[PDB]
Structure 1
Amino acid sequence: RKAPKSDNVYLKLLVKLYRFLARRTEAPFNKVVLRRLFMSRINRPPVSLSRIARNLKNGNEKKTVVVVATVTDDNRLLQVPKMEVAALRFTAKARARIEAAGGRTLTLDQLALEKPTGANTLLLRGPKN
């Protein structure tokens, strides 16, 4: 795809930023991120706090979980652990729970600033089925 389908101006800014990053870097992470911003909403299913928690249960602590999707709160997870979460947008409850647990919210432009090549990043997508 040469043109994004969405009319979000800030998403256009993001796709331009990650176009530059994918062109001028060797990063398959940047290329995958650009492709995921290009793909449509149904193809970007939500990722929940429960999914990211069970994926960071292993030795993947102290890292940046990155999802090109919307992070949704899960009522079934009683305790939210500390975690470096980057996503397109958060729900109010997920944002509050992460900030109360002690994590930080990052947008994709911030994620580019701190880690342009995606070091110490665990990349997730939601349940497609």
Structure 2
Amino acid sequence: GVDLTGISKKSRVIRHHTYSTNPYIKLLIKLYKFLAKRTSSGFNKVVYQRLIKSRSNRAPISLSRIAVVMKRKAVFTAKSKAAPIAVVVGDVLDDVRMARIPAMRVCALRFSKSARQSIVAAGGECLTFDQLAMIAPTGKNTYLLRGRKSGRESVRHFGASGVPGSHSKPYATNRGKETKRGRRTGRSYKRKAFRHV
């Protein structure tokens, strides 16, 4: 025997295959597994891992956010160079709060119809990953982006709302029911809003 106490606690849970049933997703996974194995770019490896990931971990992104980050990168770029291609492993959605945008080249798994119309009208192009693999096989001159995950209702609900320093929402259908005792100083006590950690 060999003393290997608590050795199973160093194992990590990682997904090695997709749970999706989409044949086009499977084709993309095949192509980018080949590219990641046979090239020396970190871009391909990151893209392959994100393609493997699940739907909840592939949050969508906003066209306005894309425009803002592209502008903040472009303000410090020489005028003799071309703007990078935005790349999102996920969905791109339109934004009504911003009406004027520059011409951008965007590659994504899926576009909403409004977002596609807005990009084309501004004067950009919508690309797919198979087109990207031919335009830039190693991912040179790209801009990898992710969508926002905090702000989801589930995240806002995570935790216990009755302990000091917590601001999570309780699971309740009647908004006016869980007030009074434990939430007001006049009713016995009030949950403390702040606590040093």
Q: Normalization by structure 1: what TM-score?
A: 0.96
Gaps of 5+ in 2: 1-14, 75-81, 151-197
Query: 3-state DSSP class of the match of 2:107?
Result: strand
Alignment of 1:5-24 (within 5 A): 5-24=19-38
Aligned: 1:73 with 2:94: yes
Q: Computing the radius of gyration over CA atoms, which structure comes out larger, 1 or 2? A: 2
AA in 2 matched with 1:94: A
Match of 1:109 among 130, 136, 146: 130
| 1:49-91 CA distance string (max 9 Å, x none) | 0110111012437210000010000111111211110000100
Higher relative CO (Cα under 8 Å, sequence separation at least 6) belongs to 1
AA in 1 matched with 2:132: L
Match of 1:84 among 105, 115, 133: 105
Aligned-pair identity in percent equals 55
Match of 1:125 among 136, 146, 166: 146
Moved more, 79-88 or 57-66: 57-66
Q: How many pairs were matched up?
A: 129
CA distance in 2, matches of 1:84, 1:35: 23
1:128 Cα deviation after fit: 1.6
Aligned: 1:98 with 2:98: no
Q: Which has the larger share of strand?
A: 1
AA in 1 matched with 2:61: V
AA in 2 matched with 1:51: R
CA distance in 2, matches of 1:20, 1:91: 29
Q: Normalization by structure 2: what TM-score?
A: 0.64
Query: 3-state DSSP class of the match of 1:82?
Result: coil
CA RMSD, Structure 1 to Structure 2 (Å):
1.1
1:27 Cα deviation after fit: 1.2
